[PDB]
Structure formats: C-alpha cells, structure tokens
Amino acid sequence: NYFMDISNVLEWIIYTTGIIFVLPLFVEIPAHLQWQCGAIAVYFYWMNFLLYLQRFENCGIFIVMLEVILKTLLRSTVVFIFLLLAFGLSFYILLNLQDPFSSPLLSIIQTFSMMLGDINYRESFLEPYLRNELAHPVLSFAQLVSFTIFVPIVLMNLLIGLAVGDIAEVQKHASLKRIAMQVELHTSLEKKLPLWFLRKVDQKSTIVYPNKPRSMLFHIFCFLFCSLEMEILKQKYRLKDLTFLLEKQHELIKLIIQKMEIISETE
C-alpha cells in the first residue's frame, strides 16, 4: 500500500546515496562518484526535512499551500512542454549561428531560461542586427515580439491567478485544518502504544492556576511558538408548526358551524 508514496522514495534515495558517499572507509571509490553522490544526498536531506515540519502548528499550513500550488503546476506541465517546444525549435531555426542556439536541446533550455523575462535583447537580437549577422531579420523580430507577448506576460499571469485562487481556498479553512492535523496525529500515534502505558500516562482532570506563572527556556519557547442557513432552517421549522396548528383550528371552526343552533336567522 506504500508504493504510491513519495516520502518512501525520498528515503530510499537519501539512504542509498548517503551509503555511497561514505563507503571509502571500507572500499576505495574514485572521488568523482563520491562527490556526485554527496551532491544528491545533501540536496535531498534538506529537501525531505520540510516534510517533518508538517507536524508542527506554526509551519504546516505553508507546506500544505506549497503542496497545492505544486500539484497545480504539475497539471499545467503539458501546456508548458508544447508551448516551450514550439518557441525553442523556432529559435533554433532562426538563430542558429549563435552559441546559445547551437543545439536543439540547448535552445530549449535557453527558452526555458528566457521564460522569466531575461530576454537578452541587446546581446542576441540588436547587436547581431547592426552587424548584418542575422539571417531573416524581420521574421526574427516578429518571433521576439510574439514570444514576449505569450510566455512572460500571459502564462506567468495565469500561474499567478491560479496560485491566488488556491491560496484563498486553503485559507478559507485553515483553523479547522490545523486542529484536524493535530488530532489525527494523536489518534494515529495512540493506536500503536501498549494499553498499560496508556493506563499509566493518562489523566482525567487538570488544575490550572491563572495567577501563578508557569515555569527562561519556557519563555524562549513561547516566544518561538508565537450562519444564515441555520437561522432560515429554524424559520422553516417554526412556520411548519404554525401551519399545522392553524389547520387544527380551522377544523374546530367547521365543527362549530356544524353543531350551531340557528333560530330567528333562517331563510
């Protein structure tokens, strides 16, 4: 049941790679492989260490917001791939004589770096144009203005709007989510402990002295640790009771007319 879990996979990568980084105390290994593994291990240790901050109360809401934004980015990745591959192969054909666009894969990585707005207009477009070093100059400037309109303007603002919507959705229900994570942590931890330890550690009542201060280190830890629908439903209940009582009263009045005595008002 643990196969569809990324935390297990991160632990596998960390443990194997940290084994290979340390093995020269038994078996001699070339230094290239050793530092190649040390890089991946030091990356994934501190990357995995964010997942242990989810258990705290002052931190876990940022981790769950980061999770939501990252999943939405994973949903947009296919539009990213196709649009970026379009612009990358177009710049590969247009700007072949320059060093950043020599290979197609280098051109794709260059357009991915140009995504944020580092276009390098003067170095790659203008100064080759003033030295007659651009084949197809008009097509090149038209490609430049089309790339500037599509990717850094439209797509980035799309990501910003998606992030704003997701963060508003998360912070709609933050205060319930915090206490839900705490009670889930305790009710999952309690199912594994033995029963005699539960009988020996629990309590049934607490006594709090508000005048006496609590027990320096605790002060530093405290510094680091720092409805219409139900109303209309009640309205509906009261109106239903009202119409029931009025029906009974109407029946009694018809009984009065049925049993009434009429003299000197007939015909």
Ligand X SMILES: CCCCCCCC/C=C\CCCCCCCC(=O)O[C@H](COC(=O)CCCCCCCCCCCCCCC)COP(=O)(O)OCCN
Binding residue numbers: 8, 11, 234-240
Site string for its own copies, 36-65 (x = CB under 8 A): x-xxx-xx--xx-xx--x----xx--xx-x
Q: Which residue has the tokens 């405290």?
A: 222
Choices 70-78, 178-186, 249-257, 259-267 (CB under 6 A): range interacting with ligand X: 70-78
Q: Which tokens belong to 86?
A: 């379009």
- Examine residue 173 and tell whether it contacts its own copies (CB under 8 A): no
CA-based end-to-end distance of the chain:
90
Q: To 10 degrees, what angle do helices 104-114 and 60-94 make? A: 130
- Examine residue 232 and tell whether it contacts ligand X (CB under 6 A): no
261 binds, among ligand LBN, its own copies, ligand X, none (CB under 5 to 8 A by kind): its own copies
**Separation CA 156–CA 177 (nearest Å):** 30
- How many residues touch ligand X (CB under 6 A)? 17
Burial of 150-178, coded b for 16+ CB within 10 Å and e otherwise, reads ebbeebeeeeeebeeebeeebeeeeeeeb
Nearer to its own copies, 198 or 233 (CB): 233
Q: Which residue has the tokens 């940290």?
A: 18
**Separation CA 87–CA 148 (nearest Å):** 11
Nearer to ligand LBN, 73 or 97 (CB): 73
159 binds, among its own copies, ligand LBN, ligand X, none (CB under 5 to 8 A by kind): its own copies
Q: How many CB atoms lie within 10 A of CB 84?
A: 18
Subset of 73-102 contacting ligand X (CB under 6 A): 74, 77, 81
Residue ranges in contact with ligand LBN by CB under 6 A: 5-7, 40, 47, 50-51, 54, 56-59, 63, 66-67, 70, 73-74, 77-78, 80, 108-109, 112, 139, 142-143, 145-146, 149, 224-225
